[PDB]
C-alpha cells in the first residue's frame, strides 16, 4: 500500500512525491487527475499523468468528451487509470488563472467522497493558480474518505506541513 506519508488528520495523508511515480509504484484503485472541463491534459498534473499513459488517457478522454460534452467546474468523471491505477477520477478544480470561482474548490473535493481511498494532488494548486495552503485546508475540511496527497514540490511540501493547523 501507500508508504512514507505523513498523517495530517484521521483521513488525510501527505507525501513529497511525484504523483506519476507514486501511481506507477502503488497502482492505487483511484488516482485523481487535476483535469479541466475539456479533459485536455496538456500540462501540470494532467499532462504528466497523460504522458505516463503514452497518451491513452487523452484518447479515452476525447471519446468521453465527444459523447458527453465538457465537465462542469467542480465536477468529475471516472475513466480508466490505464497503467497508473484501476481508475482515474478526473476532477475539475476552479482555475484561478482563468478567473473561475475559488468557492467551487469545495465542490471539487466533494467528488473524492465517492471513493474509499484515493491518491491525489492538491486541487486547483500549481498551474491552476490557487493557494495550495488553502487547497489543503479545503481538502481536510471536505474529504471524509482516505486521501493520500502527493505534493511534487519539496519546498511547497515543507511549507504545507509546517503551516498545517
Ligand atoms: C516523471 N515525472 C513526470 C512529471 C512531470 N511533471 N510532474 C508533476 C508536475 C506537477 C505536479 C505533479 C507532477 C510529474
Give the span between the Cα atoms of 131 and 124, in whole angstroms. 8
Of the candidates 31, 139, 18, the one whose C-alpha atom is nearest the C-alpha of residue 81 is 31
For residues 118 and 149, is the Cβ–Cβ distance under 8 A?
A: no
C-alpha cell at 82: 490505464
Determine whether the shortest distance from the Cβ of 19 to ligand 1 is under 6 A. yes
Structural domain spans, the chain = 1-165
What is the 8-class DSSP label of residue 85?
A: -
Q: How far is CA 9 from the centre of its chain?
A: 18
DSSP bridge partners of 89: 32, 78
State the distance from the centre of ligand 1 to the C-alpha of 92, rounded, in angstroms.
Answer: 18
C-alpha cell at 99: 478567473
- Residue owning the nearest CA to atom 8 of ligand 1: 45
C-alpha cell at 133: 495552503
Determine whether the shortest distance from the Cβ of 105 to ligand 1 is under 6 A. no
- Residue owning the nearest CA to atom 14 of ligand 1: 48
Kind plus residue range of the DSSP H or E element containing 21: helix 19-26
CA distances from 60 to 36, 39, 138 (A): 15, 10, 30
Enter the resolution in angstroms. Answer: 1.2
**Using H for helix, E for strand and C for coil, what is the string for 146-157?**
EEEEEECCHHHH
Amino acid at each position: 500500500s501507500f508508504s512514507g506519508y505523513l498523517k495530517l488528520t484521521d483521513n488525510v495523508y501527505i507525501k513529497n512525491a511525484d504523483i506519476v511515480e507514486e501511481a506507477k509504484k502503488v497502482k492505487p484503485t483511484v488516482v485523481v487527475n487535476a483535469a479541466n472541463v475539456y479533459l485536455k491534459h496538456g500540462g501540470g498534473v494532467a499532462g504528466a499523468l497523460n504522458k505516463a499513459t503514452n497518451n491513452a488517457m487523452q484518447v479515452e478522454s476525447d471519446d468521453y468528451i465527444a459523447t458527453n460534452g465538457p465537465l462542469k467546474v467542480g465536477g468529475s468523471c471516472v475513466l480508466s487509470g490505464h497503467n497508473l491505477a484501476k481508475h482515474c477520477l478526473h476532477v475539475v478544480g476552479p482555475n484561478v488563472n482563468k478567473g473561475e470561482d475559488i468557492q467551487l474548490l469545495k465542490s471539487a473535493y466533494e467528488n473524492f467522497n465517492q471513493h474509499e481511498v484515493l491518491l491525489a494532488p492538491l486541487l486547483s494548486a500549481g498551474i491552476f493558480g490557487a493557494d495550495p495552503i488553502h487547497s489543503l485546508r479545503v481538502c481536510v475540511d471536505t474529504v471524509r474518505t482516505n486521501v493520500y496527497l502527493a505534493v511534487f514540490d519539496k519546498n511547497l511540501y515543507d511549507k504545507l506541513v509546517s503551516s498545517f493547523l
